[PDB]
Amino acid sequence: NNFNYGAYHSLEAIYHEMDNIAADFPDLARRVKIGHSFENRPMYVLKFSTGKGVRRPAVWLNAGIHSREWISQATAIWTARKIVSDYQRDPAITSILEKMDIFLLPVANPDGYVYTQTQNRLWRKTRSRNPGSSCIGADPNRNWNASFAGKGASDNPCSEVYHGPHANSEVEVKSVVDFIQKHGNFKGFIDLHSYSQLLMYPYGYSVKKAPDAEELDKVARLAAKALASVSGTEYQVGPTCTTVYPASGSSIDWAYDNGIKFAFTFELRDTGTYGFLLPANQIIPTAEETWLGLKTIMEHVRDNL
Amino acid sequence: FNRPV
Ligand SMILES: *[C@@H]1O[C@H](CO)[C@@H](O)[C@H](O)[C@H]1NC(C)=O
Numbered sequence: 001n002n003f004n005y006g007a008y009h010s011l012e013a014i015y016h017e018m019d020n021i022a023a024d025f026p027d028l029a030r031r032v033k034i035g036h037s038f039e040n041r042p043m044y045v046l047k048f049s050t051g052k053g054v055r056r057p058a059v060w061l062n063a064g065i066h067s068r069e070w071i072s073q074a075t076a077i078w079t080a081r082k083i084v085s086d087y088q089r090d091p092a093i094t095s096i097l098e099k100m101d102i103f104l105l106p107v108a109n110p111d112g113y114v115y116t117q118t119q120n121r122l123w124r125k126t127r128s129r130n131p132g133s134s135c136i137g138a139d140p141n142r143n144w145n146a147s148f149a150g151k152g153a154s155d156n157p158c159s160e161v162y163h164g165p166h167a168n169s170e171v172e173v174k175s176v177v178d179f180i181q182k183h184g185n186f187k188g189f190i191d192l193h194s195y196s197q198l199l200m201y202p203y204g205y206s207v208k209k210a211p212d213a214e215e216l217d218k219v220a221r222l223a224a225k226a227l228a229s230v231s232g233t234e235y236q237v238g239p240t241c242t243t244v245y246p247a248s249g250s251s252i253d254w255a256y257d258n259g260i261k262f263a264f265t266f267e268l269r270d271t272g273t274y275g276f277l278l279p280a281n282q283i284i285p286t287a288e289e290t291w292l293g294l295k296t297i298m299e300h301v302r303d304n305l
Numbered sequence: 306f307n308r309p310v
């Protein structure tokens with residue numbers, strides 16, 4: 001059909017392609033509205049599932065929480081198409097889907113993404129109003145209830161890392177928290193950002209060792225090796241705090257502190273040559289290699305089931 | 306880098 005996966009797209013085009021995927025594979029993929037943004041845009045996920053069990057284990061794949069990181073939403077929509085294309089053509093994704101559901105949120109910050117397309121390509125935050133300030137938006141990746149208002153966040157609404165007035169104040173973050181909590185039985189939570197070529201695990205808010213650190217590091221290293229096998233792209237691996245910087249209130253620390261074992265952040269390409277402004281001709285190569293990383297992690301979840 | 310990622 002008429003969607004170029006090697007180009008960047010509007011929010012409406014992305015949502016339309018999600019609907020197309022659900023319509024073309026209605027026994028595998030369903031589009032679910034999980035909430036809405038500050039400006040009342042819908043938040044949509046695709047759920048990929050093969051079983052009508054109750055309480056089937058699930059993994060959550062998150063992208064585009066920071067609106068300027070365009071390679072994340074582009075990689076996510078490509079991933080949606082890859083899952084449906086390869087089902088019953090690749091035993092790896094087929095057996096993953098055999099054992100677990102996958103939820104994919106390609107645009108976790110729709111208002112910010114529209115703003116980057118129409119007003120300021122470098123916008124990061126949400127677009128919520130801050131009473132008492134003319135500064136707009138909170139950093140949705142400092143807004144989660146995991147050492148909220150700790151290190152690496154700001155109390156200042158004008159900051160790129162403003163945490164918001166309280167945990168879950170951003171309706172885009174509350175929507176995901178609420179859906180995961182009600183749905184239950186999550187085993188993985190993977191957040192796609194850019195850039196730096198890093199695959200990280202908890203914690204961002206403290207230097208303390210996650211109980212599962214040895215396993216998470218082992219799985220991240222295998223995933224990085226799989227990712228590098230496609231075109232040679234090298235990733236560094238480690239806990240967020242020392243691998244990028246301290247950051248409190250982040251999505252993967254909230255997921256892990258809530259019992260979701262396989263909690264990882266990818267910082268996708270590149271290492272700073274183009275930074276957030278990654279050329280469209282790198283979308284498909286990035287998404288192809290990232291897929292082997294995501295598959296490796298999900299294979300590990302599968303093999304624990 | 307000079308801005309958060
Ligand atoms: C955040 O988590 C803490 C855990 O101590 C809990 O007390 C609190 O209810 C949570 N806050 C919100 C706003 O969800």
Ligand SMILES: N[C@@H](CC(=O)O)C(=O)O
Pocket residue numbers: 141191193240244247250252265309310
């Ligand atoms: N490493 C952080 C980046 C950030 O939010 O500043 C993350 O998990 O996405």
Ligand SMILES: [Zn+2]
Pocket residue numbers: 066069141193194309310
């Ligand atoms: Zn980011």
